[PDB]
Amino acid sequence: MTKDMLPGSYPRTPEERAAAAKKYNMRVEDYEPYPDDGMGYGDYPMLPNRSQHERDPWYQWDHSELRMNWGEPIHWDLDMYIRNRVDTSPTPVSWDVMCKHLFGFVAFMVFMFWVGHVFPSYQPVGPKQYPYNNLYLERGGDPTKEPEPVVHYD
Amino acid sequence: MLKIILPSLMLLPLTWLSSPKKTWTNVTSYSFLISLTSLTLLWQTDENYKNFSNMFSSDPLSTPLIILTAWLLPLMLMASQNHLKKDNNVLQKLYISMLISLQILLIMTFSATELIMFYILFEATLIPTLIIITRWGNQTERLNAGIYFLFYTLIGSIPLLIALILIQNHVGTLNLMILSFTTHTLDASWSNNLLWLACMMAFLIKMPLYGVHLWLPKAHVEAPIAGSMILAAILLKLGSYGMIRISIILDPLTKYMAYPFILLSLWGMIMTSSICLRQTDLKSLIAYSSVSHMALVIASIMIQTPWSFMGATMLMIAHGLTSSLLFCLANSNYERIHSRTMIMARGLQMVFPLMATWWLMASLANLALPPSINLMGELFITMSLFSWSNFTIILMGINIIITGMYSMYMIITTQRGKLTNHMINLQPSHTRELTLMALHMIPLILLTTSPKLITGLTM
Amino acid sequence: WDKDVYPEPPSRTPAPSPQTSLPNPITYLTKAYDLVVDWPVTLVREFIERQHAKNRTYYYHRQYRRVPDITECKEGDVLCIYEAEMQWRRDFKVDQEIMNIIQERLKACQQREGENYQQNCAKELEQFTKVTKAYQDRYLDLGAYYSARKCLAKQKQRMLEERKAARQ
Amino acid sequence: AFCAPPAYLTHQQKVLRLYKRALRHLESWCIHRDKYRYFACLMRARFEEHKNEKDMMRATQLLREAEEEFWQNQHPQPYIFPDSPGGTSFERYECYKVPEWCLDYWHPSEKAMYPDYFSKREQWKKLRMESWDREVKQLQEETSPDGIMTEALPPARREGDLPPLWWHIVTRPRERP
Amino acid sequence: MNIFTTSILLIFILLLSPILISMSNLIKHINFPLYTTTSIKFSFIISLLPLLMFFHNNMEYMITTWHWVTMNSMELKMSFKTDFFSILFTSVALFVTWSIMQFSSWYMHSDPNINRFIKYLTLFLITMLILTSANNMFQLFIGWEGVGIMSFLLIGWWYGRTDANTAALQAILYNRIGDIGFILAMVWFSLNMNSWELQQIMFSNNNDNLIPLMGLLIAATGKSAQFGLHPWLPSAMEGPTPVSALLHSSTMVVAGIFLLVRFHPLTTNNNFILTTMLCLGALTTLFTAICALTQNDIKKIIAFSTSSQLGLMMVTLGMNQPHLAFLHICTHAFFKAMLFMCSGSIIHSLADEQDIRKMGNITKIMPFTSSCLVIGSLALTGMPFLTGFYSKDLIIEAINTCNTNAWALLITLIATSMTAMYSMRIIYFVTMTKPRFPPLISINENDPDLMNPIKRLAFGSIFAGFVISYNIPPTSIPVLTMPWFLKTTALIISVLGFLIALELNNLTMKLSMNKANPYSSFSTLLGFFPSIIHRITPMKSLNLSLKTSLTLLDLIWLEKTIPKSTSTLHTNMTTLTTNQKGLIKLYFMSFLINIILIIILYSINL
Amino acid sequence: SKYKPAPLATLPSTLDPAEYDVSPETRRAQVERLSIRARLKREYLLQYNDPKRVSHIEDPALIRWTYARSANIYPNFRPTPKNSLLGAVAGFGPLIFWYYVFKTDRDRKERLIQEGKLDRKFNISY
Amino acid sequence: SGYTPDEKLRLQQLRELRRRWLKDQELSPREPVLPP
Ligand SMILES: CCCCCCCCCCCCO[C@@H]1O[C@H](CO)[C@@H](O[C@H]2O[C@H](CO)[C@@H](O)[C@H](O)[C@H]2O)[C@H](O)[C@H]1O
């Protein structure tokens, strides 16, 4: 491929813009270059930031699972937006409400867990009583030393 | 060692005196037999390391690398047999001579006893590799890639020369045994710190540290398959081996002179592993995977615990084999579709079912599948670094996640998915390619059976 | 199996003490296993052992005479330092194997005792602790480039510390 | 899948699509068949209540209101036909839809196992070879003089000629191989 | 003892036999699925013997087969730990895999590569058995990670489905985030105890064991799909139904609970860990039961039921009840596998339909499958004396009568009732209402390869619970004294949930429109955890990787700073020096300046 | 309406106000877009169904995309205040952070080890 | 709505060819000629 067909630098004049559009097979009015922030985008067209999930599913795309036709301008972030990764598809519920609901549920759960920790639930019973000095020998205790006599009664 | 060097040299007369028809077969066969001969260096039934003469020696650290080098040459010839299909006989023989010379020099380097052996035989590798990249490469930027590869290493190396000369003036010799057995403590003077850097920087560049790793993504996506294989199987390990051999004198400065490079390694590992996620060139993705693994190796070597050294050596060998296999696989698909993009070719499991199996196994070695020696190495390096500071587990875990992620991303993107049915040229896998992948995998499986061979000096 | 180096308490299996009219499947399965499997396998093994009795050969555990330690080496005398260093390496790994044997004892004790391990394995836990303290004081914090000289320096640092403590 | 989308849609197409989508979502909401019929009849009543509106601005406003209501009331998890996009087993058999160009690489010993099928295939390849020239000329001659183009392709006009660009339409793998 | 160890090893040898036969030309000539089914049957029969030995003398064995390597005072031996857990679970797993491997032949007769499918299922079985019968933490890791790979390969068996590919990678994500904690546990138990063997690790009871047990808890969360890392399991049903039945319910997903049970001795003291597990189990149970309701897929409902059951096991472990938690594992394996098989039968007989809205009147048309499904549901909601009751009831008893987080207890009880509610959802919308399937009925379950496996699992679900519960040795003292309401709490809540579900479902036939509801949407969309996390985290991470790493730094700033700056400077200097006008007058003027400079240097330096 | 778009949950097409436009300018726009798409598809289909093809079909869009994401970057890069700061921080700052973390941790560890507070109970392999 | 005459003709022609190809796909009674 030659220079005219490979990308180039930021379109600085309307004739450059038209030449770039013809290069990218995009309409002269639809073609918009990335902002000239000097981050390497240069001439590449700025395409809509919609994932390939949104593309028509019933259409016989040239590149199928990619869901892009031959010669179509390719988004700068196609790898991120492929069907196997980020999905910008519309949702039945607004993102803001979804965030509120999920985080509110989490907050309620953790708050009530703290409530339970502070106020536990237990049966009305005394602590279990074990024999032989709380099993001093077989619970890992030295034979030489004598533990404090811990007694039990009726 | 001279029962292994001389046959390697004699390969060259065979290459040039063989008839045009039988040259490939003869050199491949005799190279396999040289590889067999190289196994004699595993008869170390005692703790006394082997010293075959005043010039050549071997160790637990050098024997596995030498055997790997011997093993690679036949596979390099098989991998190169194809893209050199329609070149003139002298040009083909030139390529074969370059590979043979590379093997000779690398074996001598790994088996060298004096660091000014090592400094000459280490840089002599630049010429054959530079020729391989620049002459037989495909795309136009191979010249730029060659320039980067040459000069990064030369800028690194010259200070190494200065430091080595100073070392010899101060000590009286450069035989590594003598240095080991008469070493003495350095003092924290600024001049000593500058030395430490001068000794360590050339090897760190060859083990591309995060900030000086720009010459791998270029050299690899501009180099032919054999160049990539030898490069990121042996050349990259030259840096680690040099660091291991030379750090003995440079103590105790390391305790605080390692913080910068440990940090750079432990951060660049994450950065590069992440870069692998969003890269559209299979060769580049493999190269950056290699950069992350060498980041781990550098961290472990610069902490210097027994676990660090042993795991670093194990991972050195494991990465050698695995990255080599990955590059052969990618070149397999490249020889057909004549493109390096990962997105372009997809669903190839529907037409190369067995090569898909080899792809899967390679991806597992990359992602570190237990009990594979790849994992063993990464696990032991992780244990070492966790001992060094218990917070490194955060970085290690993030890198583990991302490693698994790009490793499976390669497979899903390429092998799986709808077959790009427009590709008419996809041809059934060549027995050559399949045998190449088998010869890469089988040694890995056998070493996973017998890890004791590939441990370092420490363990 | 040298019972000394690999201690193994005695077996204390109890009586059959059956109290059921039903037949225990295990005894009959074991009888069938014995007769069917153990007997032919034992025949094969006996044949191999006779074949070994024929053509018997011997191998001897190597003995390494002691040589001067690094303490007896004049600075920079590589000739003697090499021998001292190799001796130290062999002692190092023999100590490694000592640690392996004692750890195996500890593991076998835990498994044998079961839920009494919290008391009946105290002896082997004590032995393990003492040997690991010895191992730590001998080889720990030595770099990957561990050497007799580093070990000597570490020991002398600790001895200086102990002498200071005794003085104070 | 067998027809290219238009440049746009008219009020008729948009409203019909909305009718279908809303009816299917209403069904997804109303599991039982009788309840579904009860509410679908009311839905048709609503849709036809404004059937004849000749002020297209009000028609479009009504359609916008209907669409917003639909988005408010859409079933979170609708009904998806198994093979329909987004339904289980949407592409479950794409692994085995291996193309026909692979057969060209079969070893002659493998082709021996199937003698007749490959003879018929050879006939087919001959037919395609013959028809390519004529069909390319047909498309070139039928190209519209103006610069206005549509994806839809032409039929076979002459006699004894295959329809333009037919190899990919025909020969596509069977749905369940 | 010879017989016991020999049988233990022979089980693995038998399981490897199908694999080796697969890697040979005899695979073409033999009926591989039947061969593998037979091998699994024989392996189960062999396993029965060690189970009997353990039930008799309760002797546990450490068997060291091969010495893989010695690492300076840390041997790595291929060890096996045969005990209550390992032996009983090997028996159960082999039984369930026998049933599912016979049923796979029916469910996958048409599919090509059936041999590869069977090989993969077998491989998974070997790997999971390695996990269970493992002494070394390293070997346990071999199992932990190999089952993960097999799950990846089986999910998205139909690699055509982009959705299934995403599901497999989802599983790898969540599992690896889990395995980070496992590797942390390994490294800590290596540094502080210098051994990966469980016997040696046991002596760490007197340390803190917080840093390692946190790694274990995280790994268990990831693998068993507890709330934090839960999305992977429900959406792991993109795979074939036999895979869902076996791996992602009966055998694999119990890996986290099994690991915690194995490390029960260390976690007895660390109350922080135990309370954390209590809370996590409660939260998962409630969350995934909420999602289980209002879900219209037959397989996803059962998947969420499985997640809820695993949350219950997490609570079981949160209170010091490891034996009972493992008992629940084994007991639920049966009827969960049976429910999955019944659902697979329904899905296959109908035109691969999985929506419970297009299934109805199944009880009349498929008597056998509906009967076994009813048994499975009644086991899931433990009705008295079925397999579930001989575990779940005791679990709830201990929960209600042990000191516990009050909130955790409450949500756990609510989720127990809600399990009845969604089981009723299935039993109703799939077996009680008038038909809804497409008109062309073509329903055949008379295939023995389907009938017999389900028969075996139903006999399991009906008896194994009682048999195991009565035969297992004493372990934990149970609390049997309690008020009447506590004693029958599980039954009353379950029955009340059933009645409430019946009322709600019967309310649907009312000729009135159900409206979109906030709670209905929250339940159906799975709490929005997928929609939010899976759209924010991947985007942010991937965007950072492309922009901050690859572009801003690697492709731009590093090149400018190191190579290109040097290149520039040197070009600037060459263009500064070389370009000389070429006139002798100027050249000799410069020579004059050299003259003067040398004179000055000489003078000043003297 | 009641829906509020978010960058990762786009505005549905039906709710989109512009989808309902019927201005002749908009329709002319859409027709021209379809014309471009049809021309491209015809060009692709000729090569797809050509019987005399012997190789795959190269993708100019893919080539341009890869070139733009690879070799066009540095040539079309210009230092700016924002770029300099972002690069400097995103590079060095994380290294400084991890430096402080590891240094403080290891210094505390060395302090404790020196005093003897830390107990290395069974660290044998380090 | 409804097919154009050109579309109807094209679909009919492709229908004929598609069904001929599908019938071509049938295997003859001897087709799996297993070698000895
Ligand atoms: C710490 C020490 C180690 C670091 C050492 C770094 C030294 C590296 C030196 C690399 C020098 C390579 O020199 C390389 O020359 C080529 C000529 O083809 C330049 O190539 C480029 O030049 C300019 C951009 O400035 C363009 O107009 C031109 O089209 C393009 O090819 C590269 O931009 C430059 O990098």
Ligand SMILES: CCCCCCCCCCCCO[C@@H]1O[C@H](CO)[C@@H](O[C@H]2O[C@H](CO)[C@@H](O)[C@H](O)[C@H]2O)[C@H](O)[C@H]1O
């Ligand atoms: C400490 C000493 C270290 C020395 C090691 C590094 C060696 C440095 C090599 C310097 C020479 C590199 O040579 C490099 O050539 C290229 C073109 O080839 C120049 O790049 C040039 O590209 C084109 C013309 O070709 C112009 O549009 C551009 O403006 C110009 O700069 C680089 O600016 C120069 O740097």
